[PDB]
Amino acid sequence: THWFVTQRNFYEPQIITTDNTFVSGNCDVVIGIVNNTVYDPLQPELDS
Amino acid sequence: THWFVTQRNFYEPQIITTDNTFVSGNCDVVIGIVNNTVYDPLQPELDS
Numbered sequence: 771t772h773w774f775v776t777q778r779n780f781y782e783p784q785i786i787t788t789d790n791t792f793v794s795g796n797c798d799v800v801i802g803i804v805n806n807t808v809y810d811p812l813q814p815e816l817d818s
Numbered sequence: 819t820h821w822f823v824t825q826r827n828f829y830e831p832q833i834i835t836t837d838n839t840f841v842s843g844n845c846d847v848v849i850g851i852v853n854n855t856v857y858d859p860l861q862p863e864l865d866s
């Protein structure tokens with residue numbers, strides 16, 4: 771149901787964020803890409 | 819008197835921040851943990 775990012779050699783799931791992930795280009799080029807939220811940790815701070 | 823994070827093979831003390839550190843869980847589980855202020859680099863910008 772949920773999407774997580776984890777270290778490779780031990781299951782420690784954590785929320786997808788702009789800290790855990792890096793961008794590269796538009797979605798069409800990658801074979802097998804999937805859709806999700808990526809949380810932006812600035813936004814609750816910016817909002818308050 | 820003061821707590822720093824340094825690279826391992828050459829002494830270069832840096833202030834402890836949420837950039838040069840990462841979280842995992844509450845303070846109870848770790849044997850030999852210590853208490854200090856992690857400087858959050860966004861707080862002077864939230865003050866601005």
Ligand SMILES: *[C@@H]1O[C@H](CO)[C@@H](O[C@@H]2O[C@H](CO)[C@@H](O)[C@H](O)[C@H]2NC(C)=O)[C@H](O)[C@H]1NC(C)=O
Nearest residue numbers: 771772773774775781782783784785786807809
């Ligand atoms: C996939 O993992 C997530 C995170 O552990 C599960 O979502 C939690 O599920 C429990 C039980 O239903 C709830 O109490 C939590 O509030 C849920 N957390 C969130 C952030 O939604 C999810 O149930 C797991 N999915 C499956 C199919 O096992």
Ligand SMILES: *[C@@H]1O[C@H](CO)[C@@H](O[C@@H]2O[C@H](CO)[C@@H](O)[C@H](O)[C@H]2NC(C)=O)[C@H](O)[C@H]1NC(C)=O
Nearest residue numbers: 796797798799800801802803804805806807808
């Ligand atoms: C992932 O999400 C994107 C954006 O919602 C989906 O792309 C759109 O898909 C529809 C139906 O095929 C097209 O009409 C649109 O032109 C697409 N692009 C945009 C920008 O809306 C995509 O289909 C989703 N992929 C999966 C596997 O669910």
Ligand SMILES: *[C@@H]1O[C@H](CO)[C@@H](O[C@@H]2O[C@H](CO)[C@@H](O)[C@H](O)[C@H]2NC(C)=O)[C@H](O)[C@H]1NC(C)=O
Nearest residue numbers: 844845846847848849850851852853854855856
């Ligand atoms: C590290 O800091 C925490 C938080 O101030 C200390 O936790 C307190 O410990 C006393 C022990 O008698 C408890 O009565 C308090 O309820 C605790 N506070 C909280 C907010 O839980 C902890 O003792 C400190 N550890 C060391 C080794 O100094």
Ligand SMILES: *[C@@H]1O[C@H](CO)[C@@H](O)[C@H](O)[C@H]1NC(C)=O
Nearest residue numbers: 798799800801802803804805
């Ligand atoms: C994975 O295999 C299924 C087999 O039905 C196929 O439909 C799907 O296109 C494959 N995945 C990718 C990324 O092509």
Ligand SMILES: *[C@@H]1O[C@H](CO)[C@@H](O)[C@H](O)[C@H]1NC(C)=O
Nearest residue numbers: 846847848849850851852853
């Ligand atoms: C560190 O070592 C000393 C001597 O072995 C012991 O008395 C002390 O309880 C230890 N403290 C921690 C935090 O491990």
